[model samples]
Target: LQDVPYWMLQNRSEYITQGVDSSHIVDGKKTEEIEKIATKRATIRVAQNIVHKLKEAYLSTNRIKQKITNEMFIQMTQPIYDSLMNVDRLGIYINPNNEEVFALVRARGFDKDALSEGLHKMSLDNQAVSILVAKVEEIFKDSVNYGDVKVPI
Candidate 1:
């Protein structure tokens, strides 16, 4: 996860997390060069090279053919029973104290418009559970949390 600025904890239960990897491998890049460049420029050259390398190394032989492997085990695959932001990563399960979830969330920051967009999208999404709004307070260190919600709104 080094050099990678934005590391997303793919919510497996919510969407196609593992499936994305499968799709990526099937549609993988042939070289790491393209992927490497995709992080920056994400140009056509990057896409083409990535597809090329993917076919060579992985294809059918390689089970795990993805470059980035996020650690979503704690918060994604299992139960947090606390808050969505309480865990190290993102996941779907019984989050205890619904209000507390937002409490932990308010301890961070968020982008209103952008989060609203994402949250709006989440609302429309067909997930096992609904996405909740968190209170925004202090900006999170170590990393950023797309938090910024006036819960119960």
Candidate 2:
């Protein structure tokens, strides 16, 4: 909770009681300005919760190795098991000055359609992508490359 963003902290009660889309009245009508930071904090909180659940799973003795029965103990720890599945994080972050972000990003799943649409929507060009790649290469000492893709060092 201490690490939560200021906006999220301010609207904690409303968000919890209603949902992330909860809003206050504005100009005599209900409206909500969903900040990008709010969604970022939501993801951070979700990750924290997942980590907490994983901790609980680790502490539990119902794992197959610890269980007395030779059969699987799936029923006893369904939530714990499910917490470990269906989790993914992949993205490309490009900022005007932050080379480190590009260095850290990976195109694990390429979405060319959304990517092209994004480029057009944001008015970015191939030059921008090339510059970003250059920055990433510099930050990563020019040794890092995409998975199974070759690039000049």
Candidate 3:
């Protein structure tokens, strides 16, 4: 956050408070880099949350393979999370100088798109699916609680 420009946080959540002194002492390249870092952090936090929720859903539904896969994803990326949390580093998650991680992911069948789209095709036979659907609905409400609905026809 050191090199992040004050202008970047003017009206956003990263803005300054009452008595804090901040300045726009940054150029285009530096500012762009800072913005990129900020954006990366935000994106990673969102993905982490989604994975966390997915893990919870999988656990509650006794999704054996999914739970294992989720656990692996979380564990395998520990270095990335560490770098992000520690601002001293560049926060880039560089895989070791090999395709080992890729092999592991491929072998594990970690289909990224399947989680988003294939969730709709989950076996609906179990009551756990009903519960998960309800939880998703509740989360969706919290995610977009923009007062009353204002429909336009």
TM-score of each: 0.18, 0.23, 0.33
Q: Alpha carbon lDDT of residue 101, candidate 3?
A: 11
lDDT of 3 at 62: 52
Q: After superposition, how far is residue 58 of candidate 3 from its true place, in Å?
A: 3.2
lDDT per residue as tens, model 2, 1-153: 112223322433211111122112234331122233333333343333333333344356423232222122222122222222222222222223321121111212222343333433333346643332233223223223323221212
lDDT of 2 at 144: 34
* Ten-residue region with minimum lDDT total, candidate 1: 14-23
**Which candidate number has the best lDDT?**
3
Candidate 1: C-alpha RMSD to true structure equals 20.5
Over 4 Å off in model 2, which ranges?
A: 1-34, 62-153
Candidate 2 C-alpha error for residue 110, in Å: 16
* lDDT, candidate 3, 17-129, per-residue tens: 11111223244545445444544444344335444564565666454432245445474233223322212222222123321110000010123333323343443334533
lDDT of 3 at 77: 36
Ranking by TM-score: 3, 2, 1
lDDT of 2 at 10: 40
The alpha-carbon lDDT assigned to residue 142 of candidate 1 equals 20
TM-score of 1: 0.18
Q: How far off is residue 65 in model 3, in Å?
A: 8.7
lDDT of each: 0.24, 0.28, 0.33
> Model 2, 35: alpha-carbon shift in Å?
1.0
